[PDB]
């Protein structure tokens with residue numbers, strides 16, 4: 001689990017969104033595994049606006065932050081899971097790293113701020129849903 005809190009927005013994995021998230025919905029995209037809801041309190045995270053390919057992510061199944069090299073956001077085939085059939089997920093970046101299903105939501109960050117959140121994985125790979133192109137998260 002986990003979320004990004006920027007401005008009056010909460011960014012979560014679409015497959016982990018709560019009823020309160022759906023009842024306060026701003027935007028959702030199943031192909032990206034992302035959902036954004038509105039919040040009453042202002043958050044403290046800043047979004048990275050860059051092309052970094054190295055950063056650090058939080059892995060809840062290890063209680064550790066790991067430095068990683070990750071691919072550019074792309075259209076990647078993701079195996080069937082409890083939440084989606086086997087399909088292509090867009091704006092996904094892959095890295096070598098430990099992940100388990102409940103690791104979704106962990107933040108990947110670089111020197112500029114938050115880059116995205118854990119969304120996929122298995123067999124020593126971890127995939128992150130990018131948020132750097134969502135410029136509207138910085139305003140309103």
Ligand SMILES: CSc1ccccc1CCN1C[C@@H](C(N)=O)CC1=O
Pocket residue numbers: 015033078081082083084089099100101102103104118119120121122123126127
């Ligand atoms: C850290 S994810 C992971 C790790 C180990 C094994 C399996 C997984 C993938 C689990 N997933 C991927 C999500 C998606 N974005 O399609 C939906 C879901 O249930």
Ligand SMILES: [Zn+2]
Pocket residue numbers: 048049050051052110111112113
């Ligand atoms: Zn950066």
